[PDB]
Write an enzyme that holds these catalytic residues in place. Structure first.
Site, PDB file in Angstrom:
ATOM      1  N   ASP A 132       0.885  -1.163   0.000  1.00  0.00           N
ATOM      2  CA  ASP A 132       0.000   0.000   0.000  1.00  0.00           C
ATOM      3  C   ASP A 132       0.924   1.216   0.000  1.00  0.00           C
ATOM      4  O   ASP A 132       1.489   1.562   1.042  1.00  0.00           O
ATOM      5  CB  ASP A 132      -0.942   0.001   1.198  1.00  0.00           C
ATOM      6  CG  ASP A 132      -2.153   0.916   1.001  1.00  0.00           C
ATOM      7  OD1 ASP A 132      -2.027   1.931   0.285  1.00  0.00           O
ATOM      8  OD2 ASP A 132      -3.236   0.621   1.562  1.00  0.00           O
ATOM      9  N   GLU A 192      -4.787  -1.445   3.353  1.00  0.00           N
ATOM     10  CA  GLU A 192      -4.298  -1.365   4.729  1.00  0.00           C
ATOM     11  C   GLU A 192      -4.364   0.055   5.281  1.00  0.00           C
ATOM     12  O   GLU A 192      -4.671   0.252   6.468  1.00  0.00           O
ATOM     13  CB  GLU A 192      -2.868  -1.899   4.823  1.00  0.00           C
ATOM     14  CG  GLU A 192      -2.288  -1.717   6.212  1.00  0.00           C
ATOM     15  CD  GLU A 192      -1.049  -2.544   6.452  1.00  0.00           C
ATOM     16  OE1 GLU A 192      -1.022  -3.701   6.006  1.00  0.00           O
ATOM     17  OE2 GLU A 192      -0.114  -2.028   7.091  1.00  0.00           O
TER      18      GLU A 192
END
EC number: 2.4.1.-
Length: 377
Positions: free
Chosen positions: A15, A271
């Protein structure tokens, strides 16, 4: 004079949102010198609009953002080198790390998990073949762990925002959104899901109205199919009985926070947003890109909830991620949203008392440095 260390952060696109947030906080809150190496400039442009997709070096928010070249252009190594999410360092950089009078502190930033076992592995050294060791750094929800990313003053800012009708109204208006009285606000950032139409139907058929805010992308295409509309552009609004759907414009990270803070329920993905939705102190639905992580989070998050809410919440989340039957859990869960909201605020407050991840990371370097020279702490 002030202490400053240098940080190399490598990310290959887990991410990029998490890595960028960390880089910004190291520079802004801790005054560190940060270089962020991105192997895909288009991925970074997704998360940072003001960036230059062709510039090899650029300074944004106090971070030196550099293209991860192929081939790699040799540079000196920073005091700390972070591999984000198990990407592989360039061979020349590993040499550079070894050649320093004080070799770089080498960290691997792991994905966030609520699983109990990450505590036994947090800060674990691993001796590598080249002779350096690398340390695993596990973000987490309990101790021991590397904590969660959280900017200074974040929850104070969030509380002031949620206590101001005008701040919320003005922000939503900047997105083209105006809430109707008594309308529940739901944000929908998700991946494709065959169970979405059955859930849209429940929102359409309910007694209480909902406003569903959706960004462009694959789920929006699925919403358009369910609406039986050929095209859905930013700003478009469609009404189906109790459900109003509106298309969101692109949002930078900080504006997405403000959207999370306005909504009564945030469906999120990835996330970074999973944690941001928790800081919002509001009900959330997490779509994960896995069963062990999902179930471990549910165990911890539901531990403090009344049995009835915990059962409906777990059932809904598991079905949301399995794509199965959603009808039964949502009916029961929807009736419990006010209670869940009070518990979501408590959860955010409790997590907000723990030292944040960037602070743990800087402290890890400080203690490592003192230990390297056999000094007291």
């Amino acid at each position: 004079f002030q202490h400053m260390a240098s940080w190399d952060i490598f990310c290959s696109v887990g991410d990029i949102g998490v890595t960028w947030r960390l880089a910004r906080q190291l520079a802004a809150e801790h005054g560190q010198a940060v270089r962020l190496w991105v192997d895909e400039p288009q991925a970074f442009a997704r998360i940072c609009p003001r960036a230059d997709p062709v510039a090899h070096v650029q300074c944004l928010d106090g971070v030196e953002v550099r293209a991860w070249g192929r081939p790699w252009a040799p540079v000196a190594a920073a005091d700390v080198v972070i591999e984000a999410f198990a990407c592989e360092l360039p061979e020349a950089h590993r040499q550079a790390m070894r050649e320093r009078k004080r070799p770089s502190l080498w960290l691997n930033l792991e994905y966030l998990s609520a699983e109990e076992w990450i505590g036994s592995c947090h800060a674990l050294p691993s001796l590598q073949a080249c002779g350096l060791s690398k340390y695993f750094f596990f973000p987490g929800f309990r101790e021991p762990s590397g904590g969660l990313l959280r900017e200074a003053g974040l929850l104070e800012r969030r509380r002031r925002f949620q206590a101001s009708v005008s701040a919320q109204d003005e922000f939503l208006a900047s997105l083209g959104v105006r809430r109707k009285v008594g309308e529940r606000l739901i944000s929908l950032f998700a991946y494709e899901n065959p169970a979405l139409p059955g859930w849209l139907e429940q929102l359409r058929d309910a007694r209480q109205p909902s406003l569903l805010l959706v960004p462009e992308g694959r789920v929006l295409a699925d919403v358009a199919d369910w609406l039986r509309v050929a095209t859905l552009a930013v700003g478009d609004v469609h009404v189906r009985d109790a459900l109003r759907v509106q298309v969101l414009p692109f949002m930078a990270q900080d504006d997405y926070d403000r959207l999370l803070w306005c909504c009564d329920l945030n469906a999120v993905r990835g996330e970074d947003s999973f944690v941001r939705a928790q800081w919002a102190g509001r009900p959330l639905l997490w779509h994960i890109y896995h069963l062990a992580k999902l179930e471990a989070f549910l165990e911890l998050y539901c531990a403090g909830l009344p049995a009835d809410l915990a059962e409906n919440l777990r059932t809904f989340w598991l079905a949301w991620n399995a794509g199965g039957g959603l009808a039964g859990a949502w009916e029961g869960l929807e009736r419990q949203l006010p209670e869940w909201r009070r518990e979501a605020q408590r959860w955010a407050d409790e997590q907000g008392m723990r030292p944040d991840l960037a602070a743990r990371l800087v402290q890890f370097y400080a203690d490592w440095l003192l230990e390297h020279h056999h000094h007291h702490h």
